[PDB]
Amino acid sequence: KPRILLMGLRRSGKNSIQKVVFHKMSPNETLFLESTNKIYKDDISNSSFVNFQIWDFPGQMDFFDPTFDYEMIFRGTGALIYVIDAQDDYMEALTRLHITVSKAYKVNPDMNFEVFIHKVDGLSDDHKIETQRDIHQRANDDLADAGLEKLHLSFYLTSIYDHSIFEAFSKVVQKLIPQLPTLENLLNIFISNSGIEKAFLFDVVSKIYIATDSSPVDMQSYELCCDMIDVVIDVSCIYGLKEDGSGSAYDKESMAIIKLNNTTVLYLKEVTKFLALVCILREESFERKGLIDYNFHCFRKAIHEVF
């Protein structure tokens, strides 16, 4: 349930990398200024994606004075970002995370608090395990006594520019409110006449994307599909939509296939308005119309027909 807001550890120094994250995602999150509201489960979350402002990041000097305004911002679904950095300013902030979280869980029904472990580049294979044991040791007496405080302890893989924040951000939007397990297992039924390895449901260029049945297995395929959507969108962006039609006008009749050596094809096809689908495919020779395109056409019709 993201009403995600940006609270690092210092206003003038963490906002460098926080603003790199902002200009990494939010130039395609900022479509939601006048798009819509009030109807969906992610529209409030996208309006929170819009309101990525800043505050005073150690807030325990003023536990009352700013909080008033964002009291409203922390009523109804409930999330807030938090950083676990590399240097020795981790244990005192890790102690006062309870100070940051107490008002939060007392002011709002069931929240999930996004403590990301972030930019500790230079971790060994056992040292990352013992620094995980650090938060396992000093995050016990705040979790085992609360009640309705939902915490998300995520571990970014600690480099400068890795893709390993937004599969966990995909997990938190899976944890938003899935009204679609019927759509999940019916989509598993739709990959029965398919190249059944990966069928990722995508939305528009905003870099949050949902997934079923195939995320962590045997390869980070979420990395290659992110590269896929970034390549096709950056081709279509100013090389494809500068001459006729504005760049804000998406309306994409864009399909894209990528072949590779062992007869393996990447496949993006998308309705013009908001929905998209990348369904990869194995060593198969589709020169027909009775196997793939007919039934895939039928359930892209269905996936546009659902909501």
CA 297/CA 249 separation, integer angstroms: 24
The residues near 58 (Cβ < 8 Å, ≥ 6 apart) are: 9, 10, 93, 96
The single residue among 164, 174, 254, 295 that binds another protein, judged by CB under 8 A, is 254
The single residue among 161, 192, 283, 305 that binds another protein, judged by CB under 8 A, is 161
SS (H, E, C) 104-128: HHHHCCCEEEEEEECCCCCCCCCHH
Hey, what are 63's tokens? 């536990």
Told to check if 217 binds another protein by CB under 8 A, we report: no
Told to check if 224 binds another protein by CB under 8 A, we report: yes
Nearer to another protein, 68 or 161 (CB): 161
Q: Tell me which stretch binds another protein (CB under 8 A): 39-47, 56-64, 179-187, 260-268.
A: 260-268
Nearer to another protein, 168 or 256 (CB): 256
DSSP 195-222: -TT-EEEE-SSSS-----S-SSSSS-HH
User: Residue 228 burial by CB count (10 A; 0-12/13-18/19+): exposed, middle or buried?
Assistant: buried
Told to check if 9 binds another protein by CB under 8 A, we report: no
The single residue among 10, 136, 259, 282 that binds another protein, judged by CB under 8 A, is 259
Nearer to another protein, 136 or 297 (CB): 297
Closest distance to another protein from the beta carbon of 198 (Å): 13
- Segments of 54-171 assigned E as strands: 81-84, 111-117, 149-155
Closest distance to another protein from the beta carbon of 273 (Å): 13
**Looking at this protein, which amino acid is placed at residue 201?**
L
The single residue among 238, 298, 302, 306 that binds another protein, judged by CB under 8 A, is 238
Hey, what are 45's tokens? 């979350």
Closest distance to another protein from the beta carbon of 69 (Å): 34
**Local structure of 12: helix, strand or coil:** coil
φ/ψ of 150, rounded to 5, equals -95, 125
Nearer to another protein, 137 or 262 (CB): 262
Told to check if 258 binds another protein by CB under 8 A, we report: yes
What is the per-residue binding string for another protein in 95-124, x denoting contact by CB under 8 A? Answer: ---------------------------x--
Chain residues in the site for another protein (CB under 8 A):
122, 160-161, 219, 223-224, 227, 230-232, 234-236, 238-245, 251-262, 264
